[PDB]
């Protein structure tokens, strides 16, 4: 593995959730991360994104499991290396602007976010698989910046 405890080798997620990263409990014990912690991840090209960390009983200690959405936000591939750190200041979003890349609230964004307390980071792309067609969105703006929780009080501007 990495010679630094908080650098982990990227592996495919078992749980397809854009908001989640999984570590072994032993790694979490080592880094003092806890179930449901918001974490800041750092990949290539100076990219960062925020996820929720959960234990995974089959994840090798030196590996981190995340889906393609998260990998893409970090500009890494499977078997690349990312760092993970607790991120204590992910405030509840007041207002965020989220736009489709290349109805939207009702069909895609609302059910995606509803009661899920997802962290999002400005510059994030994410895919929502709903109705009859998948749609990829970009996080254009958050208030506060540069990341926040999409909470029940949050207002989404998507048009």
């Amino acid at each position: 593995g990495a010679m630094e405890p908080n650098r982990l080798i990227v592996e495919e997620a078992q749980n397809d959730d854009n908001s989640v990263v999984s570590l072994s409990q032993a790694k979490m014990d080592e880094l003092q991360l806890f179930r449901g912690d918001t974490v800041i991840l750092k990949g290539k090209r100076r990219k960062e994104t925020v996820c929720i960390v959960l234990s995974d009983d089959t994840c090798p200690d030196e590996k981190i499991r995340m889906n393609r959405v998260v990998r893409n936000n970090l500009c890494v591939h499977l078997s690349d290396v990312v760092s993970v750190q607790s991120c204590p200041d992910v405030k509840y979003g007041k207002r965020v602007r989220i736009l489709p890349i290349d109805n939207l609230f009702e069909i895609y964004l609302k059910p995606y976010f509803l009661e899920a307390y997802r962290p999002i980071h400005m510059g994030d792309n994410f895919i929502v698989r709903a109705a009859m067609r998948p749609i990829e969105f970009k996080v254009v703006l958050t208030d506060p910046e540069p990341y926040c929780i999409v909470a029940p009080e949050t207002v989404i501007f998507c048009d």
Partner: protein, 74 residues
């Protein structure tokens, strides 16, 4: 000796290190000193049903374990 209690608020997740043999009031006092808040309650769940009582003498360690998260309601 000390354990970690995580406090979720709209400002984020604040880590509180506290002796499990301390009382719940001390937890409340600790949170007050660490945060810019007015009248708040601390709850066991995000939906705010089970309120933690501002003690003294219900011990931190009887209701909470190392790494537990509680939820702040203003």
């Amino acid at each position: 000796d000390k354990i970690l209690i995580r406090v979720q608020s709209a400002e984020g997740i604040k880590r509180i290190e506290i002796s499990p043999k301390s009382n719940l009031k001390h937890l409340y006092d600790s949170v007050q000193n660490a945060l810019k808040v007015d009248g708040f309650g601390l709850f066991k769940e995000r939906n705010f049903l089970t309120e933690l009582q501002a003690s003294g003498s219900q011990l931190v360690g009887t209701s909470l374990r190392h790494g537990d998260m509680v939820y702040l309601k203003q």
